[PDB]
Amino acid sequence: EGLPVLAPVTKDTATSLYTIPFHDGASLVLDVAGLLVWSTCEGAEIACSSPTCLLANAYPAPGCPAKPCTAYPSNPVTGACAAGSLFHTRFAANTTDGNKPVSEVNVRVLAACAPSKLLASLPRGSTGVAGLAGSGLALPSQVASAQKVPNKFLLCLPTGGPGVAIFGGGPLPWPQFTQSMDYTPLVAKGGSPAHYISARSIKVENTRVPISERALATGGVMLSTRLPYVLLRRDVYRPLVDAFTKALAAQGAPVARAVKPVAPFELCYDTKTLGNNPGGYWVPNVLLELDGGSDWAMTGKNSMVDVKPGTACVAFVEMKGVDAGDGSAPAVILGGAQMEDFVLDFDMEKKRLGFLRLPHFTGCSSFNFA
């Protein structure tokens, strides 16, 4: 039919990136801010004057500049990019009713070839990147027009086990829970595919982090799957971290011990001095108060990264190379661990992000084929 398309999502342990099967027991890296689908190939036509081509190069990625279509795939980890051209390939997955995988499907899609040197630092078995940011050549837009479904995708990233990617709308999964999904606008930024939302305020425990009037801009929160942790601009980092540490120090909890800072985190602890509760490590809750009147909760499972056995570090890292309130840079880039066990509905047609933190006793990996 024109049915939504489901792929399971793997959190790769060594990299903390998330992938989906693509074809031939090869996988792509989900990159929510990415504009292209790209991979390596074996040894497809379209003119570089064509709208398709021009749209693919309409927002040249950092390192890159700009007759067959030459596109410019980039690696989301390293920032390396490279020339390559477009080729028809197949994205093999299953259709879905919303609850489970129904039938196999190969979706005709356009990807750019990339040289193998571009796989650097991506997960073993990965041949490339599923760009999800709203566009022309991103995976959700191509699945949409290839399968005649909404230009809309759904992610439920796992902490472990297979999570969920659904492209094309349809009923929400976990209908027992997602009837109460909250919604926040996707804010348009200039020259930029990406996904932005707005938060009026951040709370640590029950109390607001003293951050301006409007530094949590309109669209000052970006989502990304490139890092596990959260990046904060200067004007948000110090105050959020300070509030977090004072609230940490007020816990009947064990007295936390600070240990040897592991990079890039400049705040780590010994896990035998962190307590454990249903939220994960017993550290203060941090809530983003989003447009829409609903909060995005973070608990220990989101706010702390288990770096090595015995140590866990606070998953807020400062942006380097950056002024306080530099409008161009987002105030908060929220990472993959801050989206795990959220059902995220990225509705590009209605300019909104549905979000719902699933209950503590389940997770994204509980989706499936009884």
């Binding site: 959190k11 796992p158 902490t159 472990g160 086990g161 027992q176 829970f177 109460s180 709370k203 425990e205 029950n206 896990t271 962190l274 454990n276 509760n277 249903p278 939220g279 994960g280 490590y281 809750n285 941090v286 809530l287 909060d295 909760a297 608990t299 220990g300 499972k301 702390m304 288990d306 866990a312 719902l356 933190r357 209950p359 503590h360 006793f361 389940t362 997770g363 990996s365 509980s366 009884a370």
Partner: protein
């Protein structure tokens, strides 16, 4: 009588939990994300008979009225869900057991790199006995936990040898509600 108190929220909404006298607790909550409140024992036991009286059970949305707890060796989380809100939790069906005037279905579910009593990133199976229809509340009610243990054992679901907390809880999510529960 009880020696363990649990009061966790993920920070969403308003969760007013009262650690009352003896085994009594109440929770009034609204506009939540997710919370769990209860009383029971620091050390669970497969032979415990839980007695409780839920004088109020008034969920508006998702909420669970459940005995639940943990073992280590191995790490298992378990649930005996006597009532709920809008949705009845399920999982992989394993069997059914009659106990304390009710019929429960037995389910397993699995959690990967998930929170637990062992850490923030852990792997375990959960065992569930979930009643077929909501247990009436307002009167003294018994959970003969051995009946559940034995029925789980008969279906290849073995608990760990060592028993951590075991609480009669109120769990609420994306919801509003009141609970008033007395455990002994």
């Amino acid at each position: 009588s009880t020696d363990y108190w649990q009061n966790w929220t993920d920070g969403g909404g308003i969760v007013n939990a009262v650690n009352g006298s003896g085994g009594n607790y109440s929770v009034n909550w609204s506009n939540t994300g997710n919370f769990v409140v209860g009383k029971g024992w620091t050390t669970g036991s497969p032979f415990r008979t839980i007695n409780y009286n839920a004088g109020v059970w008034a969920p508006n949305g998702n909420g669970y009225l459940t005995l639940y707890g943990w073992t280590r060796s191995p790490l298992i989380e378990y649930y005996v869900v006597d009532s709920w809100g809008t949705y009845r939790p399920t999982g992989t069906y394993k069997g059914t057991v009659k106990s304390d005037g009710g019929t429960y279905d037995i389910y397993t579910t699995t959690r990967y790199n998930a929170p637990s009593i062992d850490g923030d990133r852990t792997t375990f199976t959960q065992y569930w006995s979930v009643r077929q229809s909501k247990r009436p509340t307002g009167s003294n009610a018994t959970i003969t936990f051995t009946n559940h243990v034995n029925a789980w054992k008969s279906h290849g679901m073995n608990l760990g040898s060592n028993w951590a907390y075991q609480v009669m809880a109120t769990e609420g999510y994306q919801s509003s509600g009141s609970s008033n529960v007395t455990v002994w």
